[PDB]
């Protein structure tokens, strides 16, 4: 457990405080995700020096932090202090967050020229071309508008959604409906008396081609669709 933990540290009131944490769950906490605090800490203790094992006293924690709750002090140390992740952990977390940003951009934007998504490897090249800084302690949603703005000089792209009305003939509902719910975005669904089924899919516009491919498979080319609206 403790070859795996890293130090998170904070100076407060002229004293140094440290906790020993799982670096991957500390990143999740800094990004804003819910975290199980029993897995996050390698020891339910606040240290003055985690390496020498010097523990902060209850009286000192009460004086400085106004509380003795180790979990709540650990949260403050991690959010306001520095997490000493290793260089290799930082590289691994950076590569993973970059991948998620690229995929999110690919799925949720379209090229205004061609009205189609760019491939992930096109977004990746543009990220490097633009020298985009990626923040491993922020969620995708928290940083993807800024990134997309930095990309627009070299790669035009725009966030857009579509609403698409769908009708599935009775013959194909068994396969089609389940597939559509799993794809996501089903709204205003309604069974019809003749066995057919209708809905309005609300999807990211860069998912349009995937949705049409899906309907070709699950409805054998028999589904009827109508583009209702594009939403910028």
Coordinates of N, CA and C in Angstrom, one line a residue:
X1 N 0.8 -1.2 0.0 CA 0.0 0.0 0.0 C 0.9 1.3 0.0
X2 N 2.0 1.2 0.7 CA 2.8 2.4 0.9 C 4.1 2.5 0.1
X3 N 4.3 1.5 -0.8 CA 5.2 1.7 -1.9 C 4.4 2.4 -3.0
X4 N 3.0 2.3 -2.9 CA 2.1 2.9 -4.0 C 1.7 4.3 -3.6
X5 N 1.7 4.7 -2.4 CA 1.2 6.0 -2.0 C 2.2 7.1 -2.3
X6 N 1.6 8.3 -2.5 CA 2.5 9.5 -2.7 C 2.1 10.5 -1.6
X7 N 3.0 11.5 -1.4 CA 2.7 12.5 -0.4 C 1.9 13.7 -1.0
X8 N 0.8 14.1 -0.4 CA 0.2 15.4 -0.6 C 0.5 16.3 0.6
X9 N 0.9 17.5 0.3 CA 1.4 18.4 1.4 C 0.9 19.8 1.3
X10 N 0.7 20.4 2.4 CA 0.2 21.8 2.5 C 0.9 22.5 3.7
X11 N 1.3 23.7 3.4 CA 1.8 24.6 4.5 C 0.6 25.4 5.0
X12 N 0.4 25.4 6.3 CA -0.6 26.2 6.9 C -0.2 26.7 8.3
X13 N -0.5 27.9 8.6 CA -0.1 28.4 10.0 C 1.3 28.3 10.3
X14 N 2.2 28.3 9.3 CA 3.6 28.0 9.6 C 4.0 26.6 9.9
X15 N 3.1 25.7 9.6 CA 3.4 24.3 9.8 C 3.1 23.5 8.5
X16 N 3.9 22.4 8.3 CA 3.8 21.5 7.2 C 3.0 20.3 7.5
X17 N 2.0 20.0 6.6 CA 1.1 18.9 6.9 C 1.1 18.0 5.6
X18 N 1.1 16.7 5.8 CA 1.2 15.7 4.8 C 0.3 14.6 5.0
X19 N -0.3 14.0 3.9 CA -1.0 12.8 3.9 C -0.4 11.9 2.8
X20 N -0.6 10.6 3.0 CA -0.2 9.6 2.1 C -1.4 9.1 1.4
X21 N -1.4 9.3 0.0 CA -2.6 9.0 -0.7 C -2.3 8.2 -2.0
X22 N -3.3 7.5 -2.5 CA -3.3 6.9 -3.8 C -3.3 8.0 -4.9
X23 N -2.2 8.2 -5.7 CA -2.2 9.3 -6.6 C -3.3 9.3 -7.6
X24 N -3.9 8.2 -8.0 CA -4.9 8.2 -9.0 C -6.3 8.6 -8.4
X25 N -6.5 8.3 -7.2 CA -7.8 8.8 -6.5 C -7.6 10.3 -6.1
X26 N -6.4 10.7 -5.7 CA -6.2 12.1 -5.5 C -6.5 12.9 -6.7
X27 N -6.0 12.4 -7.9 CA -6.4 13.2 -9.1 C -7.9 13.2 -9.3
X28 N -8.6 12.2 -9.1 CA -10.1 12.2 -9.2 C -10.7 13.2 -8.3
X29 N -10.2 13.3 -7.1 CA -10.7 14.3 -6.1 C -10.5 15.7 -6.7
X30 N -9.3 16.0 -7.2 CA -9.0 17.3 -7.7 C -9.8 17.7 -8.9
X31 N -10.2 16.6 -9.7 CA -11.0 16.8 -10.9 C -12.5 17.0 -10.5
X32 N -12.9 16.7 -9.3 CA -14.2 16.9 -8.8 C -15.1 15.7 -8.8
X33 N -14.5 14.5 -8.9 CA -15.3 13.3 -8.8 C -15.5 12.8 -7.4
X34 N -16.5 12.0 -7.1 CA -16.7 11.4 -5.8 C -15.7 10.4 -5.6
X35 N -15.1 10.3 -4.4 CA -14.0 9.4 -4.1 C -14.3 8.8 -2.8
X36 N -14.0 7.5 -2.7 CA -14.1 6.7 -1.4 C -12.9 7.1 -0.6
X37 N -13.0 7.7 0.6 CA -11.9 8.2 1.3 C -11.1 7.0 2.0
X38 N -11.8 5.9 2.2 CA -11.0 4.7 2.7 C -10.0 4.2 1.7
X39 N -10.3 4.3 0.4 CA -9.3 3.9 -0.6 C -8.3 4.9 -0.9
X40 N -8.6 6.2 -0.7 CA -7.7 7.3 -1.1 C -6.5 7.3 -0.2
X41 N -6.7 7.2 1.2 CA -5.6 7.4 2.1 C -5.0 6.0 2.4
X42 N -3.6 6.0 2.4 CA -2.8 4.8 2.8 C -2.7 4.7 4.3
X43 N -3.0 5.7 5.0 CA -3.0 5.7 6.5 C -4.0 6.8 6.9
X44 N -4.8 6.5 7.9 CA -5.8 7.5 8.3 C -5.1 8.4 9.4
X45 N -4.2 9.2 8.9 CA -3.3 10.1 9.7 C -3.0 11.3 8.9
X46 N -2.7 12.4 9.6 CA -2.1 13.6 9.1 C -0.7 13.6 9.7
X47 N 0.3 13.8 8.9 CA 1.7 13.8 9.4 C 2.3 15.3 9.3
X48 N 3.2 15.5 10.2 CA 4.1 16.7 10.0 C 5.3 16.3 9.0
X49 N 5.7 15.0 9.0 CA 6.7 14.5 8.1 C 6.3 13.0 7.9
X50 N 5.7 12.8 6.7 CA 5.2 11.4 6.4 C 6.4 10.4 6.3
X51 N 7.5 10.8 5.7 CA 8.6 9.9 5.6 C 9.2 9.4 6.9
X52 N 9.4 10.3 7.9 CA 9.9 9.9 9.2 C 8.8 9.4 10.1
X53 N 7.5 9.4 9.6 CA 6.4 8.9 10.4 C 5.9 9.8 11.5
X54 N 6.3 11.1 11.5 CA 6.0 12.0 12.6 C 4.5 12.4 12.4
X55 N 3.7 12.1 13.3 CA 2.3 12.3 13.2 C 1.9 13.6 13.9
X56 N 1.0 14.4 13.2 CA 0.4 15.6 13.8 C -0.5 15.2 14.9
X57 N -0.5 16.0 16.0 CA -1.3 15.7 17.1 C -2.8 16.3 16.9
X58 N -3.7 15.7 17.7 CA -5.1 16.2 17.6 C -5.2 17.6 18.0
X59 N -4.5 18.1 19.0 CA -4.5 19.5 19.4 C -4.0 20.4 18.3
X60 N -2.9 20.0 17.7 CA -2.3 20.8 16.6 C -3.3 20.9 15.4
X61 N -3.9 19.8 15.0 CA -4.9 19.8 13.9 C -6.1 20.7 14.3
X62 N -6.6 20.6 15.5 CA -7.7 21.4 15.9 C -7.3 22.9 15.8
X63 N -6.1 23.2 16.3 CA -5.7 24.6 16.2 C -5.6 25.1 14.8
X64 N -5.0 24.4 13.9 CA -4.7 24.9 12.6 C -5.9 24.7 11.7
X65 N -6.6 23.6 11.7 CA -7.7 23.3 10.7 C -9.1 23.5 11.3
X66 N -9.2 23.7 12.6 CA -10.5 23.8 13.2 C -11.2 22.5 13.4
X67 N -10.5 21.4 13.2 CA -11.2 20.1 13.2 C -10.1 19.0 13.5
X68 N -10.5 17.8 13.9 CA -9.6 16.7 14.0 C -10.0 15.6 13.0
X69 N -11.0 15.8 12.1 CA -11.4 14.8 11.2 C -10.3 14.6 10.1
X70 N -9.7 13.4 10.1 CA -8.6 13.2 9.2 C -9.1 13.3 7.8
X71 N -10.2 12.7 7.4 CA -10.7 12.7 6.1 C -10.9 14.2 5.6
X72 N -11.5 15.1 6.4 CA -11.7 16.4 6.0 C -10.5 17.2 5.9
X73 N -9.5 17.0 6.7 CA -8.2 17.6 6.6 C -7.5 17.1 5.3
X74 N -7.5 15.8 5.1 CA -6.9 15.3 3.8 C -7.5 15.9 2.6
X75 N -8.9 16.1 2.6 CA -9.5 16.7 1.4 C -8.9 18.1 1.2
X76 N -8.7 18.9 2.3 CA -8.2 20.3 2.1 C -6.7 20.2 1.7
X77 N -5.9 19.3 2.2 CA -4.5 19.2 1.8 C -4.4 18.9 0.3
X78 N -5.3 18.0 -0.2 CA -5.2 17.6 -1.6 C -5.6 18.7 -2.5
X79 N -6.8 19.3 -2.2 CA -7.3 20.3 -3.1 C -6.5 21.6 -3.0
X80 N -5.9 22.0 -1.9 CA -5.2 23.2 -1.8 C -3.7 23.1 -1.7
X81 N -3.2 21.9 -1.6 CA -1.8 21.6 -1.5 C -1.2 21.1 -2.8
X82 N -0.1 20.4 -2.8 CA 0.5 19.8 -3.9 C 0.5 18.3 -3.7
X83 N 0.1 17.6 -4.7 CA 0.2 16.1 -4.8 C 1.5 15.7 -5.5
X84 N 2.4 15.0 -4.8 CA 3.8 14.7 -5.4 C 3.7 13.4 -6.2
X85 N 3.0 13.5 -7.3 CA 3.0 12.4 -8.2 C 4.3 12.3 -8.9
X86 N 4.7 11.0 -9.3 CA 6.0 10.8 -9.9 C 5.9 11.3 -11.4
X87 N 7.1 11.4 -12.0 CA 7.1 11.8 -13.4 C 6.4 10.8 -14.3
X88 N 6.5 9.5 -14.0 CA 5.9 8.5 -14.8 C 4.4 8.5 -14.6
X89 N 3.9 8.7 -13.4 CA 2.5 8.9 -13.1 C 1.9 10.1 -13.9
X90 N 2.7 11.2 -13.9 CA 2.2 12.4 -14.5 C 2.0 12.1 -16.0
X91 N 3.0 11.4 -16.6 CA 3.0 11.1 -18.0 C 1.8 10.2 -18.3
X92 N 1.5 9.2 -17.5 CA 0.4 8.3 -17.7 C -0.9 9.0 -17.6
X93 N -1.1 9.9 -16.6 CA -2.3 10.6 -16.4 C -2.5 11.6 -17.6
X94 N -1.5 12.2 -18.0 CA -1.6 13.2 -19.1 C -2.0 12.5 -20.4
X95 N -1.4 11.3 -20.7 CA -1.8 10.6 -21.9 C -3.3 10.1 -21.8
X96 N -3.8 9.7 -20.7 CA -5.2 9.3 -20.6 C -6.1 10.5 -20.7
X97 N -5.8 11.6 -20.1 CA -6.7 12.8 -20.2 C -6.7 13.3 -21.6
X98 N -5.5 13.4 -22.2 CA -5.5 13.8 -23.6 C -6.4 12.9 -24.5
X99 N -6.3 11.6 -24.3 CA -7.1 10.6 -25.1 C -8.6 11.0 -24.9
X100 N -9.0 11.2 -23.6 CA -10.5 11.5 -23.4 C -10.9 12.8 -24.0
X101 N -10.0 13.8 -24.0 CA -10.4 15.1 -24.6 C -10.5 14.9 -26.1
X102 N -9.5 14.2 -26.8 CA -9.6 14.0 -28.2 C -10.9 13.3 -28.6
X103 N -11.2 12.2 -27.8 CA -12.4 11.4 -28.2 C -13.7 12.2 -28.0
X104 N -13.7 13.0 -26.9 CA -14.9 13.8 -26.7 C -15.1 14.9 -27.8
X105 N -14.0 15.5 -28.2 CA -14.0 16.5 -29.3 C -14.5 15.8 -30.6
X106 N -13.9 14.6 -30.9 CA -14.3 13.9 -32.1 C -15.8 13.6 -32.1
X107 N -16.4 13.2 -31.0 CA -17.8 12.8 -30.9 C -18.7 13.9 -30.9
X108 N -18.3 15.1 -30.3 CA -19.3 16.2 -30.1 C -19.1 17.4 -31.0
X109 N -18.1 17.4 -31.8 CA -18.0 18.5 -32.8 C -18.1 17.9 -34.2
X110 N -18.4 18.9 -35.1 CA -18.3 18.6 -36.6 C -17.5 19.6 -37.2
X111 N -16.9 19.3 -38.4 CA -16.2 20.2 -39.2 C -17.3 21.1 -39.9
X112 N -17.4 22.4 -39.7 CA -18.4 23.2 -40.4 C -18.4 23.1 -41.9
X113 N -17.2 22.8 -42.5 CA -17.1 22.6 -43.9 C -17.8 21.4 -44.4
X114 N -17.5 20.2 -43.8 CA -17.9 18.9 -44.3 C -19.1 18.4 -43.5
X115 N -19.5 19.0 -42.4 CA -20.6 18.6 -41.5 C -20.4 17.3 -40.9
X116 N -19.2 16.7 -40.9 CA -18.8 15.4 -40.4 C -17.8 15.5 -39.3
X117 N -17.7 14.5 -38.5 CA -16.7 14.6 -37.4 C -15.3 14.5 -38.0
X118 N -14.3 15.0 -37.3 CA -12.9 14.7 -37.6 C -12.5 13.4 -36.9
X119 N -11.6 12.7 -37.4 CA -11.1 11.5 -36.8 C -10.3 11.9 -35.5
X120 N -10.2 11.0 -34.5 CA -9.4 11.3 -33.4 C -7.9 11.6 -33.7
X121 N -7.4 11.0 -34.7 CA -6.0 11.3 -35.1 C -5.8 12.7 -35.7
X122 N -6.9 13.2 -36.3 CA -6.8 14.6 -36.7 C -6.8 15.6 -35.6
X123 N -7.7 15.4 -34.6 CA -7.7 16.2 -33.4 C -6.4 16.1 -32.7
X124 N -5.8 14.9 -32.6 CA -4.5 14.8 -31.9 C -3.4 15.6 -32.6
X125 N -3.3 15.5 -33.9 CA -2.4 16.3 -34.6 C -2.6 17.8 -34.4
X126 N -3.8 18.3 -34.4 CA -4.1 19.7 -34.2 C -3.8 20.1 -32.7
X127 N -4.0 19.3 -31.7 CA -3.6 19.6 -30.4 C -2.1 19.9 -30.3
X128 N -1.3 19.0 -30.9 CA 0.2 19.2 -30.9 C 0.5 20.4 -31.8
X129 N -0.1 20.6 -32.9 CA 0.1 21.8 -33.8 C -0.1 23.0 -33.0
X130 N -1.2 23.1 -32.2 CA -1.5 24.3 -31.5 C -0.8 24.4 -30.1
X131 N -0.1 23.4 -29.7 CA 0.6 23.3 -28.5 C -0.3 23.6 -27.3
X132 N -1.4 22.8 -27.3 CA -2.4 22.9 -26.3 C -2.0 22.3 -25.0
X133 N -2.0 23.0 -23.9 CA -1.8 22.5 -22.6 C -3.0 21.7 -22.1
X134 N -2.8 20.5 -21.6 CA -3.8 19.7 -21.0 C -3.6 19.6 -19.5
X135 N -4.7 19.8 -18.8 CA -4.6 19.8 -17.3 C -5.1 18.5 -16.7
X136 N -4.2 17.7 -16.1 CA -4.6 16.4 -15.6 C -5.5 16.5 -14.4
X137 N -5.7 17.7 -13.8 CA -6.5 17.8 -12.6 C -7.9 18.5 -12.9
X138 N -8.3 18.6 -14.1 CA -9.6 19.1 -14.5 C -10.3 18.1 -15.4
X139 N -11.6 18.0 -15.3 CA -12.4 17.1 -16.1 C -12.3 17.5 -17.6
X140 N -12.7 16.6 -18.5 CA -12.8 17.0 -19.9 C -13.8 18.2 -20.0
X141 N -15.0 18.1 -19.4 CA -16.0 19.2 -19.6 C -15.5 20.5 -19.1
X142 N -14.7 20.5 -18.1 CA -14.1 21.8 -17.5 C -13.2 22.5 -18.4
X143 N -12.5 21.7 -19.4 CA -11.5 22.4 -20.2 C -11.7 22.3 -21.7
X144 N -12.8 21.6 -22.2 CA -12.8 21.3 -23.6 C -13.3 22.5 -24.5
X145 N -14.0 23.5 -23.9 CA -14.4 24.7 -24.7 C -13.1 25.5 -24.9
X146 N -12.3 25.7 -23.9 CA -11.1 26.5 -24.1 C -10.2 25.8 -25.1
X147 N -10.0 24.5 -25.1 CA -9.2 23.8 -26.0 C -9.7 24.0 -27.4
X148 N -11.1 23.8 -27.6 CA -11.7 23.9 -28.9 C -11.5 25.3 -29.5
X149 N -11.5 26.4 -28.6 CA -11.2 27.7 -29.0 C -9.8 27.8 -29.6
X150 N -8.8 27.3 -28.8 CA -7.4 27.3 -29.3 C -7.2 26.5 -30.6
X151 N -8.1 25.6 -30.9 CA -7.9 24.9 -32.1 C -8.5 25.6 -33.4
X152 N -9.5 26.5 -33.2 CA -10.2 27.0 -34.3 C -9.4 27.8 -35.4
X153 N -8.2 28.4 -35.1 CA -7.4 29.0 -36.1 C -7.0 28.0 -37.2
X154 N -6.6 26.8 -36.8 CA -6.0 25.8 -37.7 C -7.0 24.7 -38.0
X155 N -7.9 24.4 -37.2 CA -8.9 23.3 -37.4 C -10.3 23.9 -37.0
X156 N -11.1 24.4 -37.9 CA -12.4 24.8 -37.6 C -13.3 23.7 -37.1
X157 N -14.0 23.9 -36.0 CA -14.9 22.9 -35.5 C -15.9 23.6 -34.6
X158 N -17.1 23.0 -34.5 CA -18.2 23.6 -33.7 C -19.0 22.5 -33.0
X159 N -19.4 22.7 -31.8 CA -20.3 21.9 -31.0 C -21.7 22.0 -31.6
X160 N -22.3 20.9 -31.9 CA -23.7 20.9 -32.4 C -24.4 19.6 -32.0
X161 N -25.7 19.7 -31.7 CA -26.5 18.5 -31.5 C -27.6 18.4 -32.6
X162 N -28.2 17.3 -32.8 CA -29.3 17.1 -33.8 C -30.4 16.4 -33.0
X163 N -31.6 16.7 -33.4 CA -32.8 15.9 -33.1 C -33.3 15.2 -34.3
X164 N -33.5 13.9 -34.2 CA -33.8 13.1 -35.4 C -35.0 12.3 -35.0
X165 N -36.1 12.4 -35.7 CA -37.3 11.6 -35.5 C -37.1 10.2 -36.2
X166 N -37.5 9.2 -35.5 CA -37.3 7.8 -35.9 C -38.6 7.0 -35.8
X167 N -38.8 6.2 -36.8 CA -39.9 5.2 -36.7 C -39.4 3.8 -37.0
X168 N -39.6 2.8 -36.2 CA -39.2 1.5 -36.4 C -40.4 0.6 -36.7
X169 N -40.4 0.0 -37.9 CA -41.6 -0.9 -38.2 C -41.7 -2.1 -37.2
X170 N -42.9 -2.6 -37.0 CA -43.1 -3.7 -36.0 C -42.2 -4.9 -36.2
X171 N -41.8 -5.2 -37.4 CA -40.9 -6.3 -37.7 C -39.6 -6.2 -37.0
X172 N -39.1 -5.0 -36.8 CA -37.7 -4.8 -36.4 C -37.5 -4.2 -35.0
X173 N -38.6 -4.1 -34.3 CA -38.5 -3.4 -33.0 C -37.7 -4.2 -32.0
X174 N -37.8 -5.5 -32.0 CA -37.1 -6.4 -31.0 C -35.6 -6.0 -31.0
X175 N -35.0 -6.0 -32.1 CA -33.6 -5.6 -32.1 C -33.3 -4.1 -32.0
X176 N -34.2 -3.3 -32.7 CA -33.9 -1.9 -32.9 C -34.0 -1.1 -31.6
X177 N -35.0 -1.3 -30.8 CA -35.3 -0.4 -29.7 C -34.2 -0.6 -28.6
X178 N -33.8 -1.8 -28.3 CA -32.7 -2.0 -27.3 C -31.4 -1.3 -27.8
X179 N -31.1 -1.5 -29.1 CA -29.9 -0.9 -29.6 C -30.0 0.6 -29.5
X180 N -31.1 1.2 -29.7 CA -31.2 2.7 -29.7 C -31.1 3.2 -28.3
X181 N -31.7 2.5 -27.3 CA -31.5 3.0 -25.9 C -30.0 2.9 -25.5
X182 N -29.3 1.8 -26.0 CA -27.9 1.7 -25.6 C -27.1 2.7 -26.3
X183 N -27.5 3.2 -27.5 CA -26.8 4.3 -28.2 C -26.8 5.6 -27.4
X184 N -28.0 5.8 -26.7 CA -28.2 7.0 -25.9 C -28.9 8.1 -26.7
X185 N -29.7 8.9 -26.0 CA -30.4 10.0 -26.6 C -31.8 9.8 -26.9
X186 N -32.4 8.6 -26.6 CA -33.8 8.4 -26.9 C -34.7 9.4 -26.1
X187 N -35.6 10.1 -26.8 CA -36.6 11.0 -26.1 C -38.0 10.8 -26.8
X188 N -39.0 11.2 -26.1 CA -40.4 11.3 -26.7 C -40.8 9.9 -27.3
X189 N -40.4 8.8 -26.7 CA -40.7 7.5 -27.3 C -42.1 7.2 -27.1
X190 N -42.7 6.4 -28.1 CA -44.1 6.1 -28.1 C -44.4 4.8 -28.9
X191 N -44.9 3.8 -28.2 CA -45.4 2.6 -28.9 C -46.7 3.0 -29.7
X192 N -46.8 2.4 -30.9 CA -48.0 2.6 -31.7 C -48.8 1.3 -31.7
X193 N -50.1 1.5 -32.1 CA -51.0 0.3 -31.9 C -50.7 -0.7 -33.0
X194 N -50.2 -0.4 -34.1 CA -49.9 -1.3 -35.2 C -48.6 -2.1 -34.9
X195 N -48.0 -2.0 -33.7 CA -46.7 -2.6 -33.4 C -45.5 -1.7 -33.7
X196 N -45.6 -0.7 -34.4 CA -44.5 0.2 -34.7 C -44.1 1.0 -33.5
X197 N -43.0 1.7 -33.6 CA -42.5 2.5 -32.4 C -41.8 3.7 -32.9
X198 N -42.0 4.9 -32.2 CA -41.4 6.1 -32.6 C -40.6 6.8 -31.5
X199 N -39.7 7.6 -31.8 CA -39.0 8.4 -30.8 C -38.3 9.6 -31.5
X200 N -37.7 10.5 -30.7 CA -36.8 11.5 -31.2 C -35.5 11.3 -30.6
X201 N -34.4 11.0 -31.4 CA -33.1 10.9 -30.8 C -32.5 12.3 -30.8
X202 N -31.9 12.7 -29.6 CA -31.1 13.9 -29.5 C -29.7 13.4 -29.3
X203 N -28.8 13.7 -30.2 CA -27.4 13.2 -30.3 C -26.5 14.3 -30.6
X204 N -25.2 14.1 -30.2 CA -24.2 15.0 -30.8 C -24.0 14.8 -32.3
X205 N -23.9 15.9 -33.0 CA -23.9 15.9 -34.4 C -22.8 15.0 -35.0
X206 N -21.7 14.9 -34.3 CA -20.7 14.0 -34.8 C -21.0 12.5 -34.6
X207 N -22.1 12.2 -34.0 CA -22.6 10.8 -33.8 C -23.6 10.4 -34.9
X208 N -23.9 11.4 -35.8 CA -25.0 11.1 -36.8 C -24.7 9.9 -37.6
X209 N -23.5 9.8 -38.2 CA -23.1 8.7 -39.0 C -23.2 7.4 -38.3
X210 N -22.7 7.3 -37.1 CA -22.8 6.1 -36.3 C -24.3 5.7 -36.1
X211 N -25.2 6.7 -35.8 CA -26.6 6.3 -35.6 C -27.2 5.8 -36.9
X212 N -26.9 6.4 -38.0 CA -27.5 5.8 -39.3 C -26.9 4.5 -39.6
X213 N -25.6 4.2 -39.4 CA -25.1 2.9 -39.5 C -25.8 1.9 -38.6
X214 N -26.1 2.3 -37.4 CA -26.8 1.4 -36.4 C -28.2 1.1 -36.9
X215 N -28.9 2.1 -37.3 CA -30.3 1.8 -37.8 C -30.3 1.0 -39.1
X216 N -29.3 1.1 -39.9 CA -29.2 0.2 -41.1 C -29.1 -1.3 -40.6
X217 N -28.3 -1.5 -39.6 CA -28.1 -2.9 -39.1 C -29.3 -3.4 -38.5
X218 N -29.8 -2.7 -37.4 CA -30.9 -3.2 -36.6 C -32.2 -3.2 -37.2
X219 N -32.4 -2.4 -38.3 CA -33.7 -2.3 -38.9 C -33.7 -2.7 -40.4
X220 N -32.6 -3.2 -40.9 CA -32.5 -3.8 -42.2 C -32.9 -2.7 -43.3
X221 N -32.5 -1.5 -43.0 CA -32.8 -0.4 -44.0 C -34.3 0.0 -43.9
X222 N -35.1 -0.5 -43.0 CA -36.5 -0.2 -43.0 C -36.9 0.9 -42.0
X223 N -36.0 1.4 -41.1 CA -36.4 2.5 -40.2 C -36.5 3.8 -41.1
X224 N -37.5 4.6 -40.6 CA -37.7 5.9 -41.2 C -37.2 7.0 -40.3
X225 N -36.4 7.9 -40.8 CA -35.9 9.0 -40.0 C -36.2 10.4 -40.7
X226 N -36.1 11.4 -39.8 CA -36.3 12.8 -40.3 C -35.5 13.7 -39.4
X227 N -34.6 14.5 -40.0 CA -33.9 15.5 -39.2 C -34.8 16.6 -38.9
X228 N -35.0 16.8 -37.6 CA -35.9 17.9 -37.2 C -35.3 19.2 -37.0
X229 N -34.1 19.2 -36.4 CA -33.4 20.4 -35.8 C -31.9 20.1 -35.7
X230 N -31.1 21.1 -35.9 CA -29.7 21.1 -35.5 C -29.6 22.2 -34.4
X231 N -28.9 21.9 -33.3 CA -28.8 22.8 -32.1 C -27.4 23.2 -31.9
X232 N -27.0 24.5 -32.2 CA -25.7 24.9 -31.9 C -25.3 25.0 -30.4

